[PDB]
Amino acid sequence: MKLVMAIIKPFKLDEVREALTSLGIQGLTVSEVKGFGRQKGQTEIYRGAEYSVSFLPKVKVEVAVSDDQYEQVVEAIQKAANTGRIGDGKIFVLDIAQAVRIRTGETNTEAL
Amino acid sequence: MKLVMAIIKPFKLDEVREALTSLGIQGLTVSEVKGFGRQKGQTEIYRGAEYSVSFLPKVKVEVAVSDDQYEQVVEAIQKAANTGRIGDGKIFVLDIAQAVRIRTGETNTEAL
Amino acid sequence: MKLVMAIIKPFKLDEVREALTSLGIQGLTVSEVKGFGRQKGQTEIYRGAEYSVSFLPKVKVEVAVSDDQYEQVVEAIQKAANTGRIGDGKIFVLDIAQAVRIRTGETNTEAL
Ligand SMILES: Nc1ncnc2c1ncn2[C@@H]1O[C@H](COP(=O)(O)OP(=O)(O)O)[C@@H](O)[C@H]1O
Ligand SMILES: Nc1ncnc2c1ncn2[C@@H]1O[C@H](COP(=O)(O)OP(=O)(O)O)[C@@H](O)[C@H]1O
């Protein structure tokens, strides 16, 4: 099992969710983050230090998938979330050691 | 060491925290997320596309525990966070490669 | 590749970001969390149960770095985020199985 974490442009959430649904992915968890990178927000200089005054929101998508699914999922997300412009974001894949569905106590692949 | 990530119903946070305290777990980190899954929010259809108009908040609990603790922790959380109804959520266990307490520089199990 | 996750005092974000920039780290992702631990917020007791009425915000910094960088990054963060007072937070290092830059499709170390 793999945890697929994608940091994407907020306006790409709907498109990514449809891609996952097409693969029959049953659910996912989403949170708000701020992004720092080559694309930067505006700053105001005070005493030699530049205070950030604008920020770039991103959406963090976390979806647990089986090993047999993960490559297809990463592919779908990349294609859905791509604009070709700077700031498009990242996909990080983390190994999951165990998964449990709280409602049933089902483990691993049967928990998703 | 393991990072135990639980996605739970917001009204179950207090109950989960008490369970962890009973195990002598010293601390944990909590964030707000939105959940998508078999339980769905309401949508409004515009031009063939259904815009989500209601969302289902969940709370993401992240607690780092020692290998000797992790199975007990996962068990406690599952029992505390369970309602038996759809939407109860998931527990994902991730391996931790290193941990540091910022205040002391203590490493691994002594950092918790 | 490693995902370095740091839970830090909010007023330490600027200092940590400068440390990473000094190492030539190109970007990072930041989110808001609440912290529970030895430092606690205030509570109000109702029917034997203590409702939390104040909370301690922390900032979660997540930065993916190469294996050759990770020890230096963990060191920089620890020194930047340290106050010596309780509540300073934690750094957890997670192994990354794969990384992709969404804009280019570049993989692993070339994605950062
Ligand atoms: N090393 C990193 N670790 C974690 N998140 C990162 C890292 N580098 C970039 N990001 C995230 O990716 C987003 C886009 O990065 P950026 O460098 O602006 O564009 P691109 O990803 O197109 O090269 C950033 O806003 C940040 O959220
Ligand atoms: N594959 C997944 N990866 C990450 N989070 C998930 C996944 N599937 C479900 N979730 C999270 O679990 C929550 C509950 O899932 P749901 O399918 O509604 O009910 P149940 O977990 O009882 O089957 C969702 O709101 C979502 O936050």
Ligand SMILES: Nc1ncnc2c1ncn2[C@@H]1O[C@H](COP(=O)(O)OP(=O)(O)O)[C@@H](O)[C@H]1O
């Ligand atoms: N086992 C843990 N897993 C995840 N986060 C933790 C854990 N223990 C502490 N934390 C986080 O670290 C923060 C500081 O912890 P605390 O015990 O108050 O001080 P210190 O880290 O200086 O010992 C907490 O507010 C919480 O966010």
